[PDB]
């Protein structure tokens, strides 16, 4: 899981690129990483019931990553560099299960107001939920 807030350099997303568009990175793997990592994974797949000539190691390699990595995004598009980097590399929209986060609903106001206003002295419920739905109302007024 990686955040635009956590993203300090878009070079990071470059090193996420071949993971997604290509399927696996060579962008960040230093040559020792590629070489020794391949040496370990090939022996792993040899142990994984697949004894072959070549190229079947990368198959159980795909097993070990994509059945265990499943990276998820948490960005906001308002940074228009969002689509800029996708224009720089298709990985951002290639195989990416987009999810509308939300805006943020008035129901969130109401229900979270019950969720947390529950403990606030004075407990008085008619007043506290007049408050809860007043704040729903007021948050909607502030948004408009």
């Amino acid at each position: 899981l990686m955040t635009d807030n956590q993203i300090v350099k878009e070079g990071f997303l470059v090193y996420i690129n071949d993971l997604l568009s290509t399927g696996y990175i060579a962008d960040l793997f230093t040559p020792e990483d590629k070489e020794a990592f391949t040496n370990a994974v090939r022996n792993e797949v040899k142990a994984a019931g697949i004894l072959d000539s070549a190229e079947n190691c990368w198959d159980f390699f795909i097993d070990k990553v994509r059945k265990f990595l499943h990276i998820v995004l948490c960005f906001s598009p308002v940074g228009d560099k969002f689509r800029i980097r996708a224009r720089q590399f298709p990985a951002l929209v290639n195989c990416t299960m987009f999810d509308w986060f939300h805006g943020w609903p008035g129901e969130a106001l109401v229900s979270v107001a019950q969720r947390f206003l529950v403990d606030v002295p004075n407990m008085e419920e008619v007043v506290r939920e007049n408050i809860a739905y007043h704040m729903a109302y007021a948050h909607q007024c502030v948004s408009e």
Binding site: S21, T22, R66, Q88
Partner: protein, 625 residues
């Protein structure tokens, strides 16, 4: 000095007792040229100036200007030098006739045909008696060996070949900095190939050494004292120019360079690119060019350079007629030697190729840029795709029928095969129907779609590819986004199969996951994946030509030759996800792309640091964008 607008400018404010304004603004080109033509030994140089300086004012005012047309006094001087020198080399004539050989060898190289008409008119308005105009010249041995080479080259020796090699041969003895300003498909390759092979057939052996200037960083090709070590790094260009400028003073040598340029890596060549012919280096290696080496640059467009830059180099601007779509067709005709079918096929290239050509030209139009000469190369690639399965040594009527089928298919797949696909504005199947409305020797199926139709070659019936809806599969395995081919992919992969049967293939244009994965895994699984071995790379806007080159060479065994080869006997088919991600440079070049063009053209490479050939043995490509 010279200011910006007439009479008004931006100058110092308080410097006010030091100078006195005067304006030296009129070019005295008539006077100066007249001077240098007495220096070029000319008597009516008065009148010669009177005519010719105004001639080039009017050429500037009238002729369709381009990136390679100039009449500034520099090239003026060059022309006058040529005319005077050959005048003292060809004396005993009117000065105007020598002037006209100068014009003939000078402007015809760069100009177009409309420019040619204007030029003839400007000439004969001032210079009647056209027997003067384009005065007589013979290059018998040159053009005979050139036509010979072109026939041997397979390219059609369309005497625009002979015309162009005449210009180039007569300019080599004049100017050593030369440009082959052509285009994609221009066969400038063929031009210099005829040139150099023919001169190899006639002495002064023409050893050419190709390179793309936009391959790697300027430092590596150039060479340099190291910016952090101060050791002199050897330069590919300078190493070759020592091997080339020296010990190849023996005989006429050639430095070939196919590609294009940008005003970034030239500005230091100003001492060898010009007459100075003296490669001064930062480490001061001082490599002198001698008149035994020939500089040439096979190129398309001058979209980045100052006129003064290309002023040193000459421009041989080519006509498409010599390497053209019909030259491609008859070049293939040379390539086929089906001893009995040669009489038969030719007419098809007129009754099928031509009508389907004009149909595709206007009756339908696209949004994808397509070269028609490449459509001729496309139909020819279909031809060698289908040639081995044709044997005219048998009975002539079934052979002629099956071949007529083959060729009408070849228009379908080479000219509607490049047409706008479905889902834009009704172009693909409308092409197909209007083309099968023009099949003549063999029956045309208006049933269903001829698009759908493989054709049972004997019984002459046109079977749908829905006979091959198979294969079918969909299951997560070592899974990601999943794909499976069907009918259209079957026909497409059969097309590419007939291609790779000749080791041929084509690049690929389209959106992501439009069948791409299905197609690639399909072609991979069809035959020995040792041979059908691939290499998938998405190449992005930020990783570039060296970042491409490093990710190129992992499957590249470097075996004998030395060649960039595949590991053992196999035919790699490297895959490119999206080549249209990489960024253009400041001069609008995605030098990774041009590096790929270098890979595919020469079929090999030299490392930026090494001086070693790494040719290409059996590779193929798979390039989407």
């Amino acid at each position: 000095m010279n200011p910006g607008y007439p009479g008004r400018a931006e100058l110092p404010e308080s410097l006010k007792a030091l100078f006195r304004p005067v304006s030296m603004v009129v070019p005295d080109l008539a006077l100066i040229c007249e001077i240098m033509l007495m220096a070029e030994g000319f008597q009516m140089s008065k009148i010669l100036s009177r005519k010719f300086v105004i001639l080039y004012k009017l050429c500037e005012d009238l002729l369709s200007k381009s990136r390679h047309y100039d009449w500034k006094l520099r090239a003026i001087k060059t022309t006058l030098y040529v005319a005077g020198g050959m005048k003292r080399a060809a004396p005993e004539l009117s000065e105007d006739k020598v002037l006209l050989r100068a014009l003939r060898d000078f402007n015809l190289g760069k100009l177009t045909a409309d420019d040619t008409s204007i030029f003839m008119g400007l000439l004969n308005d001032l210079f009647p008696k056209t027997l003067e105009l384009v005065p007589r010249a013979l290059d018998k041995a040159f053009d005979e060996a050139a036509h010979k080479a072109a026939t041997e080259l397979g390219y059609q020796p369309d005497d625009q070949f002979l015309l162009k090699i005449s210009q180039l041969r007569e300019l080599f003895v004049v100017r050593w900095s030369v440009f082959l300003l052509g285009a994609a498909g221009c066969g400038k390759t063929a031009v210099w190939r005829t040139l150099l092979r023919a001169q190899n057939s006639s002495g002064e052996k023409t050893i050419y050494q190709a390179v793309n200037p936009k391959a790697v960083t300027r430092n590596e090709l150039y060479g340099y004292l190291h910016p952090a070590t101060r050791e002199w790094k050897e330069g590919l260009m300078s190493v070759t120019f020592r091997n080339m400028a020296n010990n190849k003073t023996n005989k006429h040598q050639w430095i070939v360079l196919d590609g294009d340029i940008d005003a970034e890596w030239i500005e230091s060549m100003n001492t060898v690119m010009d007459d100075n012919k003296m490669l001064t280096l930062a480490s001061n290696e001082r490599i002198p060019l001698t008149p035994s080496m020939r500089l040439l640059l096979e190129i398309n467009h001058m979209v980045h350079c100052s006129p003064a830059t290309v002023s040193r180099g000459g421009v041989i601007f080519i006509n498409a007629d010599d390497v053209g779509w019909q030259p491609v067709v008859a070049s293939w005709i040379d390539k086929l030697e089906a001893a009995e079918y040669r009489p038969l096929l030719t007419a098809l290239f007129t009754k099928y190729v031509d009508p389907c050509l004009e149909h595709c030209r206007r009756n339908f139009k696209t949004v994808v840029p397509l070269p028609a000469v490449n459509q001729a190369m496309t139909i020819c690639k279909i031809l060698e795709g289908i040639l081995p399965k044709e044997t005219v040594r048998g009975a002539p009527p079934p052979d002629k029928k099956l071949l007529h089928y083959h060729f009408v298919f070849a228009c379908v797949w080479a000219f509607g095969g490049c047409m706008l696909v479905d889902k834009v504005t009704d172009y693909r199947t409308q092409f197909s129907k209007w083309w099968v409305s023009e099949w003549k020797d063999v029956q045309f199926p208006e049933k269903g779609l001829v698009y759908d139709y493989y054709v049972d070659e004997q019984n002459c019936i046109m079977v749908p590819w829905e006979d091959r809806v198979t294969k079918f599969q969909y299951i997560p395995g070592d899974f990601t986004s999943l794909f499976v081919p069907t009918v259209e992919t079957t026909r497409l992969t059969y097309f590419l199969d007939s291609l790779v049967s000749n080791k041929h293939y084509a690049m690929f244009v389209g959106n992501t996951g439009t069948g791409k994965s299905a197609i690639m895994v399909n072609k991979l699984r069809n035959m020995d994946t040792e041979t059908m071995s691939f290499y998938t790379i998405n190449m992005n806007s930020l990783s570039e030509a060296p970042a491409l080159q490093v990710i190129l060479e992992q499957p590249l065994e470097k075996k004998s030759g030395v060649r960039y080869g595949p590991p053992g006997s196999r035919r790699m088919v490297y895959f490119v996800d999206d080549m249209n991600m990489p960024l253009v440079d400041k001069y609008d070049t995605q030098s990774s792309i041009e590096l790929l063009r270098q890979m595919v053209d020469y079929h090999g490479w030299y490392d930026k640091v090494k001086i070693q050939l790494k040719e290409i043995i059996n590779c193929q490509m798979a390039a989407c964008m």
